[PDB]
């Protein structure tokens, strides 16, 4: 079905009353006083803004931000260098170089993320079979140097040891959906 937006049904009915009304629309700007009144109404409403550093925007557990490399509750490193977080990374941001650890364990000697190539898509954390790399809540990690945004294993593990108290909760909230 369709409908017309600017098609007059039919014309040619005018008397002195309608002429007066149109001539008073003109010469008084009556359809402009309505815009003035609208903007005046908006002057007396509560503004939608927030004192940002002190009160902030609402986010959800699914929110995907800064990355982190997680650990088990035993402190054991949770990644195993299965090397598919970089298989699927559609920006080729992730590199891995892996070896046995001298304990006899599949673990990494390298986990880099050029966060200037990352598109923050979540594919790595929904591809990891062990919930090792995640995309956490921190969106406030701006820098004054390009080289700082090129991460490695130690920075990601620092993030994990920092944000575990948040990431564990976000995961607890969002699983049963993923």
């Amino acid at each position: 079905t369709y409908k017309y937006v600017n098609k007059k049904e039919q014309e040619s009915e005018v008397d002195m009353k309608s002429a007066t009304d149109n001539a008073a629309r003109i010469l008084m700007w009556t359809e402009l006083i309505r815009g003035l009144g609208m903007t005046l109404s908006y002057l007396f409403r509560e503004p939608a803004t927030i004192n940002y550093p002190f009160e902030k925007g609402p986010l959800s557990p699914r929110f995907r931000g800064e990355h982190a490399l997680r650990r088990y509750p035993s402190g054991e490193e949770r990644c195993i260098a299965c090397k598919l977080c970089e298989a699927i990374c559609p920006a080729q941001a992730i590199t891995i170089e892996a070896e046995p650890r001298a304990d006899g364990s599949r673990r990494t000697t390298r986990y880099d993320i050029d966060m200037t190539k990352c598109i923050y898509c979540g594919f790595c954390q929904e591809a990891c079979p062990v919930d090792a790399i995640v995309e956490g809540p921190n969106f406030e990690f701006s820098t004054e140097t390009h080289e700082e945004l090129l991460y490695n294993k130690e920075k990601l593990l620092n993030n994990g040891d920092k944000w575990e108290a948040e990431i564990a909760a976000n995961i607890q909230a969002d699983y049963l959906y993923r």
Binding site: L43, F44, E46, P47
Partner: protein, 68 residues
Amino acid sequence: MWFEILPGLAIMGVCLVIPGVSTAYIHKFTNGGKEKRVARVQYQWYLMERDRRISGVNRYYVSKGLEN
């Protein structure tokens, strides 16, 4: 909120009030308890030049009366 505009409006108003009261009081102070004379025509200028030359001091705003 909209009452957070009243500070700037208040500075603006206190600043727009001064040019008037200031001019009035400066006029009264120089000319002396009197509005500053308007001389739109040559007759008023004649009156003021007269009152200057009556004073004994070259000031048109002493207003010598019936003590003469």
